[PDB]
């Protein structure tokens, strides 16, 4: 059976921790925003 989809949340860049925008030069850290407010970042593959 198929279940709808697992939506991975947008990454929050803290001082130091789970996520960083500089980690992967091959990924572009695109801003994710809904309702006009920024929810975080996700690593698209362009740069």
């Amino acid at each position: 059976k198929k279940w709808p989809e697992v939506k991975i949340p947008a990454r929050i860049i803290t001082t130091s921790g789970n996520a960083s925008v500089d980690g992967n030069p091959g990924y572009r850290p695109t801003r994710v925003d809904s309702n006009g407010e920024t929810m975080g970042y996700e690593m698209r593959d362009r740069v």
Binding site: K2, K7, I8, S16, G17, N18, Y27, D45
Partner: protein, 372 residues
């Protein structure tokens, strides 16, 4: 089902094999690379994407991407390429007839497990799947039911205290400081001698330099004073193009960021204090056994002299009557996979698998109540 598979998908390395084996059959970096140059020759079979060892070999023309950062998948499209390579190209097996035991660091986002489950069941159609904690598996490889496991890989350092068959989740600690941060720090400190490694392939070059030449000093200030007389501690490393570099005090300043995270600008305490805090967060009666069974595991803990330094610092923190023992096997780099293969071949573990029937009737959220 023929046999179970064990895949230790760490931040930087992928270790795949079969349950019951004593070593991973396939080991390759968790890298997806794509060409960053023009391409003028027609034919030649120029693929638009390379995975694992092939990407490493061709890295001179590729932009290398790690789909996993700090033990968390940042790009699932490339993670699916990693898994497809792992199953069809490395193991040469059909996932539809083999259970898959995956690994994850503790305190990960819950959606990371859910998408692992969804991909394993919907795109690979695995009959069964499980997601075990990396440090818990490492205790299996040590043949112990009691002790604290200090596990450091490419992206995550975590400590899990385990008494007799029982873990203590409140005492589990995690640092987002591991081999990747040390590689970047070595890249930044090699510029003091004029070396300017910047590209992703040069990141792998610096990682090789780190793995071959970095080591943990027993006394940092004394070794700095010794390296001030700069003739003995310096080592030469030949780059892939023939130019050789000289590295001196950077050899031990390179792993020192593990014990002094302030070298990276981090506020967190070192790995020695992380283990001590993890032990002190447990019950008083069990601390004595955790001190004598401090298991060291992970590829980052492969620096020479790291066990002696860990013993030196923990003896200074723990009460003087405790007998501190740092248990560093020769196979720390594969302890997680060995424990996963042991667990996946236990008769008592066969009912702990997430069955395909359970996924059908419960969805990806089954992983939270079935695994851990």
């Amino acid at each position: 089902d023929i046999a179970a598979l064990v895949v230790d998908n760490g931040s930087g390395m992928c270790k795949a094999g079969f349950a019951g084996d004593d070593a991973p059959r396939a080991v390759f970096p968790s890298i997806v690379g794509r060409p960053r140059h023009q391409g003028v020759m027609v034919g030649m079979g120029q693929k638009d994407s390379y995975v694992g060892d092939e990407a490493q070999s061709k890295r001179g023309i590729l932009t290398l991407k790690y789909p996993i950062e700090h033990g968390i998948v940042t790009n699932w499209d490339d993670m699916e390429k990693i898994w497809h390579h792992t199953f069809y190209n490395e193991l040469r097996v059909a996932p539809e007839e083999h259970p898959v035991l995956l690994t994850e660091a503790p305190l990960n986002p819950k959606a990371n497990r859910e998408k692992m489950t969804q991909i394993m069941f919907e795109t690979f159609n695995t009959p069964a799947m499980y997601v075990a904690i990396q440090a818990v598996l490492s205790l299996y490889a040590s043949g112990r039911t009691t002790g604290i496991v200090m596990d450091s890989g490419d992206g995550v350092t975590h400590t899990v205290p385990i008494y007799e068959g029982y873990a203590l989740p409140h005492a589990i600690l995690r640092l987002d400081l591991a081999g990747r941060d040390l590689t970047d720090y070595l890249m930044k400190i090699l510029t003091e001698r004029g070396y300017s490694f910047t590209t992703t392939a040069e990141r792998e070059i610096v990682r090789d330099i780190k793995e071959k030449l970095c080591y943990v000093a027993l006394d940092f200030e004394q070794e700095m004073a010794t390296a001030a007389s700069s003739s003995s501690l310096e080592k030469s490393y030949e780059l892939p193009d023939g130019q050789v570099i000289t590295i001196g005090n950077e050899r031990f300043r390179c792993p020192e960021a593990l014990f002094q995270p302030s070298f990276l600008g981090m506020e967190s305490c070192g790995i020695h204090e992380t283990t001590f805090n993890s032990i002190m967060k447990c019950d008083v009666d069990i601390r004595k056994d955790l001190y004598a069974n401090t298991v060291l595991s992970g590829g980052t803990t492969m620096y020479p002299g790291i066990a002696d330094r860990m013993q030196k610092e923990i003896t200074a923190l723990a009460p003087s009557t405790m007998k501190i023992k740092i248990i560093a096997p020769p196979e720390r780099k594969y302890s997680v996979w060995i424990g996963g293969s042991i667990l996946a071949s236990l008769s008592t573990f066969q009912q702990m698998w997430i069955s395909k029937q359970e996924y059908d009737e419960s969805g990806p959220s089954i992983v939270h109540r079935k695994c851990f």
